[PDB]
C-alpha cells in the first residue's frame, strides 16, 4: 500500500543530537604523556 511504501522509504533516518554550549565535558587520557623534554624544575632561592 501507499502508506507502506512511504514508511519503508522514510523510516530509517539517523537521530540528530544537539548539545548546548558551555556544558562540562571530560577527557580520559588514553596514552601516557611525557613532558621531560619541554619542562624543568629549579628551586626558588630562599630569601
Amino acid at each position: 500500500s501507499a502508506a507502506a511504501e512511504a514508511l519503508r522509504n522514510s523510516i530509517n533516518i539517523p537521530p540528530t543530537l544537539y548539545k548546548n554550549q558551555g556544558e562540562r565535558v571530560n577527557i580520559l587520557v588514553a596514552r601516557d604523556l611525557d613532558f621531560s623534554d619541554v619542562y624543568s624544575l629549579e628551586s626558588i632561592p630562599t630569601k
Binding site: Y18, N20, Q21, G22
Partner: peptide, 28 residues
C-alpha cells in the same frame, strides 16, 4: 512538536558592579 532546548538564560535583577576593587594588573 519539539525543538532544541535553549541554554539557561541568566536573570537580570541582581545587578552589581563587577570591580569591587581596582585590579592590581592596572598597576593600581
Amino acid at each position: 512538536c519539539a525543538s532544541a532546548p535553549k541554554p539557561k538564560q541568566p536573570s537580570d535583577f541582581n545587578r552589581e558592579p563587577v570591580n569591587k576593587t581596582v585590579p592590581v594588573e592596572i598597576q593600581r
